[PDB]
Each structure stands twice: as structure tokens, then as C-alpha cells.
Ligand binder design. Structure first.
Ligand SMILES: [Mg+2]
Length: 166
């Protein structure tokens, strides 16, 4: 079921090619082109699916990323600031997404704000190196994490919505 579930989620996300990290100069510049193209296609797909759920940008070097994600539940829209650094051993090593404002509020987070994914994620990423990039990190990592953790925080009453939906 795991392979089909992955296929269903990632099939229209552009696959990445270049096995290069932030200290790899011209090859890193090339990897960043692939990252940006994969991300923009993923965003376009999300818009078409009425699920435009994140924005991301980086510094000039492409080593530090920041943005926002949105989560809708019972006609209320929640917004969270997100960030991550690119590991030196990327794309082998997946970046650690952080949602620092949630620090302490959930057990599925490391001290500091880095989200704690299930044990299934790292092996899935590893099997696919270097095909997965930041768009896949969002779709396979952060997305599913929000779908469990945010409803839990809502029921505990420890976060508040940004806006209502009609
Ligand atoms: Mg906020």
C-alpha cells in the first residue's frame, strides 16, 4: 500500500536529477533550478486542486528557506510560519522542517520546533535519493504531519484561526 500511496501523492511532481548539496557550486545552482521548477509545478497542481496550502522562498544561496503553510478545519483557516536549513549532505539527508510557534504544544516535535515525522519517512526518502526534493518534503512530510497534529491542537484549544471560511 505504501508504494501506491507514494505514487498517488507524487506522480505530478517533477522528479529531481542532480545529486548535489549547498557546497557543490555549479551543480548546486543546477539542483536549485530543479527544486524551483518542482516547487512551482507542485503549487500550480495545488491551486487546481483547491489546496494551495503553502508558500516558500529562500535566500540568494538557496540554503535557508522560510515561508508559511495554511490548514483548513471545520471552516476555519490556520496559518503557521515555517523554516528550514539545507543540510550539507542534501539531497541524501532530508531537511528538518520547523514550525517554531508550535514548540511545546505537541509531542511530535523536537525541542526547537522541528517537526517529528513517523519512522516511515526517512526510509522512503532514502530509497528515492536524489529524486525527491523540497516539493516532496512538503507533500510527503509536512502535509501529513499537519493532517494529524493540527486537528489535535485544535481539539486541545491551544491554537487559534487566522480567518474563517464561508
Ligand atoms: Mg502566525
Amino acid at each position: 500500500m505504501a508504494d501506491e500511496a507514494t505514487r498517488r501523492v507524487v506522480s505530478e511532481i517533477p522528479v529531481l536529477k542532480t545529486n548535489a548539496g549547498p557546497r557543490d557550486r555549479e551543480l548546486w545552482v543546477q539542483r536549485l533550478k530543479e527544486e524551483y521548477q518542482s516547487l512551482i509545478r507542485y503549487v500550480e497542481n495545488n491551486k487546481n486542486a483547491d489546496n494551495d496550502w503553502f508558500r516558500l522562498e529562500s535566500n540568494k544561496e538557496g540554503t535557508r528557506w522560510f515561508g508559511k503553510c495554511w490548514y483548513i478545519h471545520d471552516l476555519l483557516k490556520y496559518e503557521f510560519d515555517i523554516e528550514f536549513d539545507i543540510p550539507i549532505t542534501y539531497p541524501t539527508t532530508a531537511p528538518e522542517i520547523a514550525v517554531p510557534e508550535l514548540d511545546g504544544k505537541t509531542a511530535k516535535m523536537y525541542r526547537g520546533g522541528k517537526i517529528c515525522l513517523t519512522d516511515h519517512f526517512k526510509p522512503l526518502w532514502a530509497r528515492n535519493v536524489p529524486k525527491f526534493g523540497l516539493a516532496h518534503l512538503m507533500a510527503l512530510g509536512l502535509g501529513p504531519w499537519l493532517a494529524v497534529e493540527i486537528p489535535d491542537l485544535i481539539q486541545k484549544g491551544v491554537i487559534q484561526h487566522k480567518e474563517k471560511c464561508n
